[PDB]
Write an enzyme that holds these catalytic residues in place. Structure first.
Site, short mmCIF file in Angstrom:
data_model
loop_
_atom_site.label_atom_id
_atom_site.label_comp_id
_atom_site.label_asym_id
_atom_site.label_seq_id
_atom_site.Cartn_x
_atom_site.Cartn_y
_atom_site.Cartn_z
N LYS A 68 35.47 51.51 28.73
CA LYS A 68 36.75 51.64 29.43
C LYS A 68 37.64 52.73 28.82
O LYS A 68 38.50 53.30 29.49
CB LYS A 68 37.49 50.29 29.42
N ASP A 196 50.96 41.82 27.10
CA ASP A 196 49.51 41.77 27.03
C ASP A 196 48.97 42.27 25.70
O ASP A 196 48.99 43.47 25.41
CB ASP A 196 48.94 42.60 28.19
MG LIG Z 1 42.85 42.49 29.31
#
Ligand SMILES: [Mg+2]
Ligand SMILES: Nc1ncnc2c1ncn2[C@@H]1O[C@H](COP(=O)(O)OP(=O)(O)O)[C@@H](O)[C@H]1O
Ligand SMILES: [Cl-]
Ligand SMILES: [Cl-]
Ligand code: NA
EC number: 3.6.4.10
Length: 378
Positions: A68, A196
């Site tokens: 990613k 997050d």
């Molecule tokens: Mg995540």
């Protein structure tokens, strides 16, 4: 389909399906609700998910992770150039595009980041299929709010390659908000803060929601702050402990270090629900076993600075959103690391006692919301 919601994470991925007004976060073959974004190549086979991460300590060169971080980027990208230095696998330049190069069945092969991610998506798709007993075709795949068009296109491409018809690519923070029903219309706009803290990256987004329309008020974070950094602090702590008790330094034994790291990651999770965790590794170094333990307090001490640093990006986001702490109506926890009690305390204290939305497993919130949106789009 039904259509499924998939969180293609940097470190762990998750899949959910909305049926009968409820989301089912689907467990994999090993009973795990989230799956490692890993793929390994050997002389005889290709492994994905748990099977891949389980052998990372012995096959570091051909076990790929962090795809990613490369997806949708050019080889020349400064971040790619930086990241490459830390990975045990090779990244080569193919016409200006990064490709990971591994050995598979005795031959050298290279894969585009979307090809590696398509393998992870295939695993997630099959996980959903085993549960549904039906072919899964349609899906909503999530991405970080900061992803550009190329990164989004590449993520969608990974889905296509995996045999998925990507209904839509939506932001992870928006998905988390959807999971809690914060997208439901109420007329007056609401300010939501998505905190997050995952396995590899930290990100905060401030959204303004009016009649289901998501207005990103601000964003902030640290692309290099996550649970893996906490495991690290524990690893170094235990390398010191082993050295004291056994007068041996395991630092140069790549496998011993990776095995200790796994033991630390595990102990860490246990510390989110217990005030103590045991570590018992067999044949850690030179036939020497390492049986020990660690307290929640110790774990907190070792990571004190890292934990607290999460507040800076929070202040930054608020300031940029031209918002005061009090204007935040909802604080949503996302990422497995937000399950750490000390992190929750720091964030609550910062918000002067405000309650945190944490009823949905943080490491599942993104997939949960994606599953809801997929149903809506179907
Ligand atoms: Mg995540
Ligand atoms: N109960 C827990 N307590 C603390 N950390 C946890 C817990 N469960 C998972 N983690 C950590 O969460 C991180 C993965 O977060 P996750 O949200 O699943 O992935 P990603 O960040 O890749 O989207 C890893 O560092 C993992 O060790
Ligand atoms: Cl599986
Ligand atoms: Cl809810
Ligand atoms: Na994830």
């Amino acid at each position: 389909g039904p259509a499924v919601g998939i969180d293609l994470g940097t470190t762990y991925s998750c899949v959910g399906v909305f049926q009968h007004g409820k989301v089912e976060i689907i467990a994999n073959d090993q009973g795990n609700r989230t799956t490692p974004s890993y793929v390994a190549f050997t002389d005889t086979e290709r492994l994905i998910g748990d099977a891949a991460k389980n052998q990372v300590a012995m096959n570091p060169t051909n076990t790929v992770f962090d795809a990613k971080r490369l997806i949708g980027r050019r080889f020349d990208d400064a971040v790619v150039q930086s990241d490459m230095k830390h990975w045990p696998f090779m990244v080569v330049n193919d016409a200006g595009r990064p490709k990971v190069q591994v050995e598979y069945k005795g031959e050298t092969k290279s894969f585009y980041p979307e090809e590696v991610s398509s393998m992870v998506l295939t695993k997630m798709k099959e996980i959903a299929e085993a549960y549904l007993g039906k072919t899964v075709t349609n899906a909503v795949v999530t991405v970080p709010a900061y992803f550009n068009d190329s990164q989004r296109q590449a993520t969608k491409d990974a889905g296509t390659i995996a045999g998925l018809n990507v209904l839509r690519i939506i932001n992870e923070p928006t998905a988390a908000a959807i999971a809690y029903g914060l997208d439901k219309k109420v007329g007056a706009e609401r300010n939501v803060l998505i905190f997050d803290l995952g396995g590899g990256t930290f990100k905060v987004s401030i959204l303004t929601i009016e009649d289901g329309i998501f207005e990103v008020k601000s964003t902030a974070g640290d692309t290099h702050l996550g649970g893996e950094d906490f495991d690290n602090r524990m690893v170094n702590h235990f390398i010191a402990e082993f050295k004291r008790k056994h007068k041996k330094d395991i630092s140069e034994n790549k496998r011993a270090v990776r095995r200790l790291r796994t033991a630390c990651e595990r102990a860490k999770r246990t510390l989110s629900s217990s005030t103590q965790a045991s570590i018992e590794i067999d044949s850690l170094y030179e036939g020497i076993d390492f049986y020990t333990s660690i307290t929640r307090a110790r774990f907190e001490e070792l990571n004190a600075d890292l934990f607290r640093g999460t507040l800076d990006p929070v202040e930054k986001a608020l300031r940029d959103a031209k918002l005061d702490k009090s204007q935040i109506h909802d604080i949503v926890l996302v990422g497995g690391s937000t399950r750490i009690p000390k992190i929750q305390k720091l964030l609550q204290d910062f918000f002067n006692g405000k309650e945190l939305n944490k009823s949905i497993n943080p490491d599942e919130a993104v997939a949960y919301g994606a599953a809801v949106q997929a149903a809506i789009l179907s």
